[PDB]
From a paper:
[name] ([name]) is a ubiquitously expressed RNA-binding protein with diverse roles in RNA processing. The carboxy-terminal part comprises an intrinsically disordered low-complexity domain (LCD), which contains regions enriched in glycine, hydrophobic residues, and glutamine and asparagine (Q/N). The abnormal assembly of [name] ([name]) in neuronal and glial cells characterizes nearly all cases of amyotrophic lateral sclerosis (ALS) and around half of cases of frontotemporal lobar degeneration ([name]). Here we report the cryo-electron microscopy structures of assembled [name] from the brains of three individuals with the most common type of [name]-[name], type A. [name] formed amyloid filaments with a new fold that was the same across individuals, indicating that this fold may characterize type A [name]-[name].
The fold consists of five connected layers formed by R272–Q360 in the LCD. The first two layers are formed by the glycine-rich region (G274–G310), the hydrophobic region (M311–S342) contributes the third and fourth layers, and the Q/N-rich region (Q343–Q360) forms the fifth layer. The fold is centred around a kinked, 11-residue β-strand formed by A321–Q331 in the fourth layer, which forms steric zippers with β-strands in the neighbouring third and fifth layers and imparts an arrangement that resembles a three-bar chevron badge. Owing to this resemblance, we hereafter refer to the fold as the chevron fold. In addition to hydrogen bonding within intermolecular β-sheets, the filaments are stabilized by hydrogen bonding ladders formed by glutamine and asparagine side chains and by staggered stacking interactions between aromatic residues. The third, R293, is located in an unusual buried position inside a compact loop linking the first and second layers. The side chain of R293 is completely buried in the main conformation of the chevron fold, and its positive charge is only partially compensated by hydrogen bonds to the surrounding peptide groups. The overall effect of this buried charge is expected to be destabilizing. We proposed the hypothesis that the burial of this residue may have been facilitated by the post-translational modification citrullination (deimination), in which the charged guanidinium group of arginine is hydrolysed, yielding a neutral ureido group. Analysis of filaments from the brains of the individuals with type A [name]-[name] by mass spectrometry established the presence of [name] molecules that were citrullinated at R293.
Residue numbers in the entry:
A (entry chain C), B (entry chain B), C (entry chain U), D (entry chain A), E (entry chain D): 272 to 360
The structure:
Amino acid sequence: RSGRFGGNPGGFGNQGGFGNSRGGGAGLGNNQGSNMGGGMNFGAFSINPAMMAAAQAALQSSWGMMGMLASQQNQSGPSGNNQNQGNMQ
Amino acid sequence: RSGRFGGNPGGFGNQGGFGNSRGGGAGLGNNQGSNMGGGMNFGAFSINPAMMAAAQAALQSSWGMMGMLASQQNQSGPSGNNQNQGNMQ
Amino acid sequence: RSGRFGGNPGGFGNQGGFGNSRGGGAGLGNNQGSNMGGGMNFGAFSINPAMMAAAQAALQSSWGMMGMLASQQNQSGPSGNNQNQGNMQ
Amino acid sequence: RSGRFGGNPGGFGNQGGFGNSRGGGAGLGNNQGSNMGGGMNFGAFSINPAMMAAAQAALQSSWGMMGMLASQQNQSGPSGNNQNQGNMQ
Amino acid sequence: RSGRFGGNPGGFGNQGGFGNSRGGGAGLGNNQGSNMGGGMNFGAFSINPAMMAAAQAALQSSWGMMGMLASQQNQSGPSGNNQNQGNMQ
């Protein structure tokens, strides 16, 4: 057994004011042989976020436990494309 | 047994003010041999979010437990395309 | 047994003010050999969201437990297309 | 047994103000060998959302437990198409 | 058994003021043979965040326990593309 994470509860008491936090958890954990990105925005529990992303990319991944024996992965990336995106006003 | 996550409950007490948090969880966890992205926006529990994404990409992934034996994955990416997207006003 | 997630209940007490949170959960978890993206917007429980996405892409994935033995996946991506999308006013 | 998710109930107490939340859940979970995207908008429980998506894409996926033995998947993507979409005013 | 993380609960007591924290957790942990990036923004539990990312990239990863025997990974990156993204006002 492996890859455990504990809880982050809020606890006992009142809360007031501006931009405070108690307990909570955020991030990227326990992923196996996976790809995340190549042009991606992620936003949660937030006030007025603004985000811009632009990517020309190639990603390749692999995980094996008594696996990937006498095998092959082959990838050729994007070639010769044209793309235009307008304004947000 | 593996890959456990604890709960993040809010707890006991009142809450007032501006932009506070107690307990909660957000992110990307326990994915196996998967792809996420290549032009994607994600927004939840938020006020006035604004997001722009543009991608030219290739993604390839694999997971095996007594698997992927004497096998092959082959990928050729996008080639020679044209794309135009207008304005948001 | 594996891949467990705890609950994030709200708890006991009153709530007022502007943009506060207690308990809750959001994201991408426990996916196996799947693809998510290539031009996608996702929005939930939000006020005035604005989102633009544009993609030229190829995605390929695989998961095997005593599987994918002496097998093959082959993919050739998009080639030679034209696309125009107008304005939103 | 695997792939469990806990409940996110609202709890006990009053609620007033602007843009607050208690309990709740949103996202993408426990999918096996599936495809999601290639030009898709998703919106739920929201006020005045605006979304634009444009895609030229290919997606391919597979899941096997004592499966996918001596087998094949073959895909050739879109080629030589023309498409125009007008304005929303 | 390995790769354990303890909980960061909030504890017992009241909380007021401006920008304080008690307990909590944030980051990237326990990933195996995976890729994260190539044009990506991530924001959670925040007030007025602003983020810009631009990438021309290639990423390649691998994990094996009695795996990756007599095998190969081959990657050729993006070549000859053009991309323009507009303003956010």
